Structure 1
Amino acid sequence: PNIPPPFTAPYAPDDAEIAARLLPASHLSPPQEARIHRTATRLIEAIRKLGGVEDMLREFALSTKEGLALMVLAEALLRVPDARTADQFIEDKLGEGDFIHHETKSTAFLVNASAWARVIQPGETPDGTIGRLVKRLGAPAVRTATRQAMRLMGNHFVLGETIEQALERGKPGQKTRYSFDMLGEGARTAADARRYFDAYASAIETIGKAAGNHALPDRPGISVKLSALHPRFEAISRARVMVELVPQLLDLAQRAKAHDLNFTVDAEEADRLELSLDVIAATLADPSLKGWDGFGLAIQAYQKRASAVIDYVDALARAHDRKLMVRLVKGAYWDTEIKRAQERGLDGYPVFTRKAMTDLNYVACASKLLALRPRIFPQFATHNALTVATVLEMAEGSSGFEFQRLHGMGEALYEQLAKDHADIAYRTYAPVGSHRDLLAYLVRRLLENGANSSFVAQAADYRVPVPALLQRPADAIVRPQAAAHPRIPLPCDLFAPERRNSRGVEFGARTALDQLLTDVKAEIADATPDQAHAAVAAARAGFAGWSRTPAGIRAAALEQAAHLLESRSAHFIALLQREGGKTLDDALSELREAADFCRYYAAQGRKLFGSETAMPGPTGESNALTMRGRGVFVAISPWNFPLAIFLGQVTAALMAGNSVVAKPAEQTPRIAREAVALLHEAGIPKSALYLVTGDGRIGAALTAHPDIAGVVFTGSTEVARSINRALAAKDGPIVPLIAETGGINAMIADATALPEQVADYVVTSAFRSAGQRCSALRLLFVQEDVADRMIEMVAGAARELKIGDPSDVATHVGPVIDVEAKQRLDAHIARMKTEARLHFAGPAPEGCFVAPHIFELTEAGQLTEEVFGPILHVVRYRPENLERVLRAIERTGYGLTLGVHSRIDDSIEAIIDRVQVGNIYVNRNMIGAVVGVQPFGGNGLSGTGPKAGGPHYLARFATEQTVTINTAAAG
């Protein structure tokens, strides 16, 4: 049969339609249900008859953060050479003080062994995760919880500083009772991708030398992650991924085949499904994998596409005439998928949103997989007693499949299953790898053991009666229309009923990305000072009628502008790419933001200007407060968000009842002209909105005009002051100036932060849009104990960014706006090269490009200007010198964005309390403020306020009027 086409199932179909088929098909005869019920009751009875992570979380009532901190402290304590020394520490030091120090050191130990190896003053304020733990449970219970974490870490994990040390520790002249769930994921650098490859290769040899003499399926397996093997494993980098990753995955599959092992490609996020299936298919196709039945992959039942992934895998197996071992799981990234679909404004969720639907689809999928025997050998990975009992019933035997579990979970379940059914096979995986890969793995692990819907958690809570654990999924759903979770809105309804959300696109769905790429590919004289003056006068004339147009009618025009923007998204995205130099995601994002500005100011507009506010007062008198347009606003906009900031400023002014003269940046008048024509078409009268183009001279003519009633300006600090001076110089009214200006934006990362995550956030914040965002990271402060690893990881990550033509989908970093910008940037770079350590200087293509650069400074004071390009500055610091760091941030006088990366709530809160920055971003990137979600704007040298996209913005464009009427003659 034919090799199947590239996988392209619909990403997020409707749950009800799926439920309409799954509900009737799940029906079981009374004797089938009786067997299921009995088997499952027995399994749970055994479960409720050792210790696991969930038990520790439940016993001390620990959050996932606290669980994490104790397990990290436990691993550090287990690696102390002399056990008595750890014992001394636990009793004498732990819980007595140095709470943050212990948490910081034990976490740093995971990337910098040297870091972990003092005298504690009494009466120390208990802060940090551990100190807060101690205030809550008492120091003695914390010691007890750490010792339990120590038994868990020592018994359920195979760990070392290096893979060689992990592998040596996990050794059995016999066979290992465990398959390896390797720790690695998401290479950030080319060197990370090689390290993980070598770890996998080394693991396979160790596993091989101890594999026993039986045939599959009774040989050990290894689990592998595509993201570990390639530093840009993403849909937009598919071309380079097919060429680079496939040979590497092939090399490991071959090494595995030589020991006749089970080799399994793990399933990761929904946006990587298609790409992974492409990688897997091309790899499987190689003739070198013939005559071996161990190749396989995981398939996630929580996805709506799961059943189609099974069809695809089967056709693949028939086309190449292979036997595959296929792992069926529910799925480990549920929270991530919900969040991403909301952020990306998708039209639905790739996963089910009711737990019972996952459970339903898992059983339907198991049923399908069982009938693909013997070509497919199904592996059912679950620790759910009901799921196990149900799959066992459907198999009608015990041959041709196995179950799977993770070391430290499901032990009692599968022991009992083995007693009641001697021919049952189950595979046990152990997590194996290096300390530097532990944190990322622990976080994912802890979300499921801490989940309340989790079977493992409930079974361990004796409040939950056994029969509750045995509810059939079909009886929890009942009706197809109930399939979706009622308390989780679709992304388009995220703000309902306040306003509609703009639509995004899933780049990981090739149908969506291809169409978007296709639609997009398918798509000005200056003004004289006299024309600018005529513009003001014409706007002054149109003001009277526009200010008196009812607020509902002004709002309707904004909402219609939003609708037309989204309807013509391809036209505007094409402009943003060609005139703005933006990558596809930046342009799409800008388009969304422009439409979000319209709907949001429209909604705030009705609330603010829709009706008067009655003031309390004496009887026989009415007092009403209203807000009226001010006059003609002059809107001056920058080149870097030439559509969204342009429209945000303009539609705010219009919404408040002002007429507008808008002057866009010299570099981007075409998009501004398309925007203005669009507003006119949406309902803005020709007499309320005028576009005037030209240089700073034209801008200065507008702002010097005696008849204007206010200025809204976004741009350089220097120009804002001159505008402010030109206004204050007039003898007329003092008009409002709203000025959003630059920043020297810092980020603080401590040693409790995950270095791979921070690296991601730093790369994005500093280098996305070639650093041409006002919110961009300019200055990273990183704690010395993790500084070398963090810097190396950011540098290695920056080197994987494709720089080039913005219209190419694979491009990460497009050109800077113009030659003058490139000249200023290249001059700062030349200076920094003689002044500070160069950690990275990327290769730029010929043309208007500047590549990411990373410099380390001796001190923050060496950075004195905002440099508007892809250039990161790094300062390493000592933990006790945080005060010097905070002062260094205060000293610039700026205050736009600040990033904070830390596990420690008390440190985060101490930083928030201290700084005056407009936008603080904790444990995520510092860019992409969402309208109505992150009201965006800074203070000090960074801006005047109020914040754009927030609830205090519109009022500033208007003036108040109080009407007081003596009503006593009416009675």
Structure 2
Amino acid sequence: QQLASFLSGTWQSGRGRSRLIHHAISGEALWEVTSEGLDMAAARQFAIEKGAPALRAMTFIERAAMLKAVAKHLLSEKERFYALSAQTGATRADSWVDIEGGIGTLFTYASLGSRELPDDTLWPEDELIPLSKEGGFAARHLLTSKSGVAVHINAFNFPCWGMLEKLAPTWLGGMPAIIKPATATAQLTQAMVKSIVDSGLVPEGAISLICGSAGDLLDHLDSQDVVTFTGSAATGQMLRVQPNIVAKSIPFTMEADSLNCCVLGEDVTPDQPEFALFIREVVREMTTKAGQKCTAIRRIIVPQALVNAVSDALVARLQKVVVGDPAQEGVKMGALVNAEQRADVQEKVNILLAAGCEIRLGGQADLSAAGAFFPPTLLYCPQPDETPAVHATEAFGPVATLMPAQNQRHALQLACAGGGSLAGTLVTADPQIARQFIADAARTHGRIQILNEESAKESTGHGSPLPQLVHGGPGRAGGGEELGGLRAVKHYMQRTAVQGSPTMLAAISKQWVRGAKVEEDRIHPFRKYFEELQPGDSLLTPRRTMTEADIVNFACLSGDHFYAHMDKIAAAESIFGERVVHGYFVLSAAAGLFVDAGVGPVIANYGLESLRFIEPVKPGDTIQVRLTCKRKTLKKQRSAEEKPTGVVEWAVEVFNQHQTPVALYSILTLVARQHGDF
């Protein structure tokens, strides 16, 4: 049965030697995949000249709303996703983690792109870099998108999630994606891609799919293309030396396998709850997805005096794990996905047994069953600093080795000896042990969960890559970084330092900068609605002379009786030389000078972005304020009852009679819109 690739808008299918998808829990072939004969150059052509300008013509707020719409469309029909994910041997909890983590990544990137991305095609990530003494030459860093495609080459473990946490930063960065899922599980990926395409939410050409091999895709990529890999370190190092990827110098974000430490600390004794949650965390992390996640614990580092206690606890807990069919009751661990994956796990176990030891039912795995069942395996290494095969071989299933340490200076070396890893974990309660652990073992791990009794109540777990934390470590883990919040959408963008005058950077960035030209238009910018506020709409307020009575009345009313304001003697011996006006009174007299009293579009105050005081304000010293509009960034009216509104940022430039800028800062302000979206 054909599993149809989606290229150039048409659900095509290959013509050649076809690989086939075994069912995981039963063993039959109910799909077969092929991509031979599919024109990949025409696919990249259709993507670049169809879906790339359609994505790049949107603002970032529109792309975040599109991500939220696709997330709510994928949430409304998740039951067929569970039905397709049960074919991968996963349980209901494992498939829940996969599907709902993949959709929660979409909701998270929708929230981040709605809250912290501009109402613009472009995105200035800096504030401003003043490069001149007069101020007529400055620069700021723009993040324009890329006019090419993103090739995503995914592993078999998370067909929904591992595709859909790459698809969200790619779409939020305005590039079309060509997902190459792993052939061993691509039916759930085609279910996801079909649910996306048959909804009318995304533009045409904004997503492709090649069920099967790419073949002639990496030889066609231009320098505006990025490639994001997810697989083993034997494949991606051959894909890195691909001649077009190094010739056109395209970003190849490789991210590969890792031996993940789980260090028990010296302070933890078996009477504590810390020991019980250590054993629970290692067992749950080794039995989730039958140990087929990259962030699963595969090396357990324990203190030397606690090895027998940890081993007896793990044997007493892991024999309660029932391996079997996910649909029948009383089954905790599901299965693997292939007999080939089962043979690969067992031939890695025999490599670990060629120089290691044994604790439980390990390499005794039936290679003749009608199912990809592998028993939960705990190994042992009595000489951890002498066997390099433990620190170089990952058995990608329920297998996890154990090895002793010597008083928190061998445990750090055994944690760092993984050759560069992902998702480490220390389980302690002493905070200085965690400090010494991060000071040495954060060089090799891309994520480290310090698990104590306070953490374990609402902990996401060891093997839950959050969509707002950097997923990926150095060395053997690939060196790439994903999911870093808004760090991930910057792999799909070009960072450009745009030099020039501030009145030019204002027109480029669609904001106001510091020394740009202003639009003073005889009426108050607080009287304007959101749609008629332009970035640059300024206001030169009237003045106010700061006197000693102002200092006295503000120090009385606030209660801030600080000595530089209320003492004539101590202020003469301070850095100021005499008594100065409160900085909060400058901040309040500013808003006294620029706020419209009348009822208008301005709703609330919402916060204050970045205040700095520069020169002290004295008695006998006037104050004049320059309110000017800086950013607009409309909100999205989450209900039908809430008013259409947007959050305008105003740059405030107070100064004195010598025009030197005392207290320049930036207020946010929620401003009502005249027209909504509903």
Shorter-chain TM-score: which interval? 0.5 to 0.7
Task: Identify which of 465, 470, 490 aligns with 1:929.
Answer: 465
Give, in whole Å, the separation in 1 of the partners of 2:142 and 2:475: 31
The CA RMSD measured in Å over matched residues stands at 2.6
Match of 1:640 in 2: 157
Give, in whole Å, the separation in 2 of the partners of 1:552 and 1:729: 32
Give, in whole Å, the separation in 2 of the partners of 1:529 and 1:651: 29
Give, in whole Å, the separation in 1 of the partners of 2:35 and 2:220: 15
1:737 and 1:604, CA in 2 relative to 1: closer, same or farther beyond 3 A?
Answer: farther
Give, in whole Å, the separation in 2 of the partners of 1:532 and 1:820: 29
| In the alignment, structure 1 residue 877 sits paired with structure 2 residue 393 | no
1:598 and 1:682, CA in 2 relative to 1: closer, same or farther beyond 3 A?
Answer: farther
| In the alignment, structure 1 residue 848 sits paired with structure 2 residue 347 | no
Match of 2:619 in 1: none
Give, in whole Å, the separation in 1 of the partners of 2:233 and 2:393: 11
Give, in whole Å, the separation in 1 of the partners of 2:72 and 2:45: 31
| In the alignment, structure 1 residue 683 sits paired with structure 2 residue 201 | yes
Give, in whole Å, the separation in 2 of the partners of 1:527 and 1:894: 35
1:877 and 1:684, CA in 2 relative to 1: closer, same or farther beyond 3 A?
Answer: same
Match of 1:948 in 2: 483
Letter in 2 for 1:796: A
Question: Could you tell me how far 1:528 is from its partner in structure 2?
Answer: 2.2
Equivalences for residues 536-615 of structure 1 within 5 A = 536-542=44-50, 543-578=52-87, 580-606=88-114, 607-608=116-117, 610-611=119-120, 612-613=123-124, 615=128
1:682 and 1:898, CA in 2 relative to 1: closer, same or farther beyond 3 A?
Answer: farther
Give, in whole Å, the separation in 2 of the partners of 1:810 and 1:727: 52
CA contact (8 A) 1:583 1:807 kept: yes
1:774 and 1:727, CA in 2 relative to 1: closer, same or farther beyond 3 A?
Answer: farther
CA contact (8 A) 1:938 1:947 kept: no
Question: Could you tell me how far 1:856 is from its partner in structure 2?
Answer: 0.7
Task: Identify which of 906, 913, 918 aligns with 2:439.
Answer: 913
Question: Could you tell me how far 1:800 is from its partner in structure 2?
Answer: 0.6
Question: Could you tell me how far 1:620 is from its partner in structure 2?
Answer: 6.0
1:963 and 1:770, CA in 2 relative to 1: closer, same or farther beyond 3 A?
Answer: same
CA contact (8 A) 1:554 1:654 kept: yes
Equivalences for residues 53-132 of structure 1 within 5 A = none
CA contact (8 A) 1:664 1:672 kept: yes
Q: Could you list the per-position Cα deviations for residues 471-508 of structure 1 after superposition, in whole angstroms to 9, with x for gaps in the alignment?
A: xxxxxxxxxxxxxxxxxxxxxxxxxxxxxxxxxxxxxx
Q: How many residues of Structure 1 are paired with residues of Structure 2 in the alignment?
A: 440
CA contact (8 A) 1:825 1:869 kept: yes
Equivalences for residues 412-423 of structure 1 within 5 A = none
Match of 2:240 in 1: 724
Q: Could you list the per-position Cα deviations for residues 599-620 of structure 1 after superposition, in whole angstroms to 9, with x for gaps in the alignment?
A: 2222333424544436355656
| In the alignment, structure 1 residue 748 sits paired with structure 2 residue 280 | no
SS in 2 for 1:704: coil
Letter in 1 for 2:211: T
Question: Could you tell me how far 1:682 is from its partner in structure 2?
Answer: 5.7
Give, in whole Å, the separation in 2 of the partners of 1:800 and 1:608: 48
Q: Could you list the per-position Cα deviations for residues 207-253 of structure 1 after superposition, in whole angstroms to 9, with x for gaps in the alignment?
A: xxxxxxxxxxxxxxxxxxxxxxxxxxxxxxxxxxxxxxxxxxxxxxx
Answer with 610-619 or 796-805: which moved more.
610-619
Equivalences for residues 173-192 of structure 1 within 5 A = none
Match of 2:333 in 1: 813
Equivalences for residues 289-438 of structure 1 within 5 A = none
Match of 1:180 in 2: none
Structure that is richer in strand per residue? 2
Give, in whole Å, the separation in 1 of the partners of 2:494 and 2:118: 11
Question: Could you tell me how far 1:831 is from its partner in structure 2?
Answer: 4.4
CA contact (8 A) 1:609 1:626 kept: no
Letter in 2 for 1:663: K
CA contact (8 A) 1:557 1:684 kept: yes
SS in 2 for 1:705: coil
Give, in whole Å, the separation in 1 of the partners of 2:434 and 2:498: 47
Equivalences for residues 149-168 of structure 1 within 5 A = none
Letter in 2 for 1:857: C
Letter in 1 for 2:424: L
Give, in whole Å, the separation in 2 of the partners of 1:635 and 1:828: 27
SS in 1 for 2:241: helix
Question: Could you tell me how far 1:566 is from its partner in structure 2?
Answer: 1.8
Give, in whole Å, the separation in 2 of the partners of 1:724 and 1:833: 32
1:802 and 1:582, CA in 2 relative to 1: closer, same or farther beyond 3 A?
Answer: same
CA contact (8 A) 1:838 1:855 kept: yes
CA contact (8 A) 2:218 2:244 kept: no
CA contact (8 A) 2:260 2:418 kept: no
Q: Could you list the per-position Cα deviations for residues 36-73 of structure 1 after superposition, in whole angstroms to 9, with x for gaps in the alignment?
A: xxxxxxxxxxxxxxxxxxxxxxxxxxxxxxxxxxxxxx
SS in 2 for 1:874: strand
Give, in whole Å, the separation in 2 of the partners of 1:675 and 1:609: 29
Q: Could you list the per-position Cα deviations for residues 115-169 of structure 1 after superposition, in whole angstroms to 9, with x for gaps in the alignment?
A: xxxxxxxxxxxxxxxxxxxxxxxxxxxxxxxxxxxxxxxxxxxxxxxxxxxxxxx
Letter in 2 for 1:589: V
Task: Identify which of 347, 357, 366 aligns with 1:827.
Answer: 347
Question: Could you tell me how far 1:936 is from its partner in structure 2?
Answer: 2.4
Letter in 1 for 2:314: V
Give, in whole Å, the separation in 1 of the partners of 2:301 and 2:165: 33
SS in 1 for 2:326: coil
| In the alignment, structure 1 residue 938 sits paired with structure 2 residue 473 | yes
CA contact (8 A) 1:609 1:656 kept: no
Match of 2:316 in 1: 796
Letter in 2 for 1:686: E
Q: Could you list the per-position Cα deviations for residues 691-713 of structure 1 after superposition, in whole angstroms to 9, with x for gaps in the alignment?
A: 11213xx2x53223233611111
1:970 and 1:714, CA in 2 relative to 1: closer, same or farther beyond 3 A?
Answer: same
Question: Could you tell me how far 1:527 is from its partner in structure 2?
Answer: 1.6
1:857 and 1:621, CA in 2 relative to 1: closer, same or farther beyond 3 A?
Answer: closer
SS in 1 for 2:170: helix
- Percent identity, aligned pairs only, is 20
Give, in whole Å, the separation in 2 of the partners of 1:624 and 1:729: 30
CA contact (8 A) 1:747 1:779 kept: yes
1:807 and 1:705, CA in 2 relative to 1: closer, same or farther beyond 3 A?
Answer: farther
Match of 1:693 in 2: 211
Give, in whole Å, the separation in 1 of the partners of 2:330 and 2:243: 46
Question: Could you tell me how far 1:799 is from its partner in structure 2?
Answer: 0.8
Give the unaligned 5+ runs of structure 2.
1-31, 269-273, 505-515, 519-678
Question: Could you tell me how far 1:689 is from its partner in structure 2?
Answer: 1.2
Question: Could you tell me how far 1:826 is from its partner in structure 2?
Answer: 1.6
Give, in whole Å, the separation in 2 of the partners of 1:693 and 1:533: 16
SS in 1 for 2:409: helix
Task: Identify which of 179, 182, 191 aligns with 1:665.
Answer: 182
User: Normalization by structure 2: what TM-score?
Assistant: 0.61
1:830 and 1:955, CA in 2 relative to 1: closer, same or farther beyond 3 A?
Answer: closer
SS in 2 for 1:687: coil
CA contact (8 A) 1:564 1:682 kept: no
User: Normalization by structure 1: what TM-score?
Assistant: 0.43
CA contact (8 A) 1:529 1:701 kept: no
Match of 2:412 in 1: 886
Give, in whole Å, the separation in 1 of the partners of 2:39 and 2:472: 32
Q: Could you list the per-position Cα deviations for residues 180-221 of structure 1 after superposition, in whole angstroms to 9, with x for gaps in the alignment?
A: xxxxxxxxxxxxxxxxxxxxxxxxxxxxxxxxxxxxxxxxxx
SS in 2 for 1:718: coil
Give, in whole Å, the separation in 2 of the partners of 1:562 and 1:727: 37
Give, in whole Å, the separation in 2 of the partners of 1:872 and 1:643: 26
1:571 and 1:729, CA in 2 relative to 1: closer, same or farther beyond 3 A?
Answer: closer
